[PDB]
């Protein structure tokens, strides 16, 4: 809410100060990436 005004008790995060002093919002976790890549399985090399 903004003081000295009738606009109050609204839910959300206004763009005035989303940082709230905090220098960074952190979220940690795991991430799994099933991808396709270039591997010959050490099977494209010279014979010798």
């Amino acid at each position: 809410s903004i003081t000295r005004t009738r606009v109050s008790r609204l839910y959300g995060l206004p763009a005035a100060n989303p940082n709230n002093g905090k220098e960074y919002y952190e979220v940690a976790g795991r991430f799994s990436l099933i991808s396709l890549v270039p591997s010959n399985d050490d099977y494209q090399t010279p014979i010798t």
């Binding site: 399985d41 099977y43 494209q44 090399t45 010279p46 014979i47 010798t48």
Partner: protein
């Protein structure tokens, strides 16, 4: 006149040297290991 045969067989060791000489100027063509086998059939994931 049989000596020719006896010499042709006797001096045949020098053949090796000649081959080496003929291999001196010969170009080299070295092969690499080649994949074969049960290559699994992989395709795109269900895409919409």
């Amino acid at each position: 006149a049989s000596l020719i045969y006896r010499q042709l067989l006797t001096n045949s060791y020098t053949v090796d040297l000649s081959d080496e000489i003929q291999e001196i100027g010969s170009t080299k063509t070295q092969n690499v290991t080649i994949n074969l086998g049960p290559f699994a059939q992989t395709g795109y994931a269900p895409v919409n």
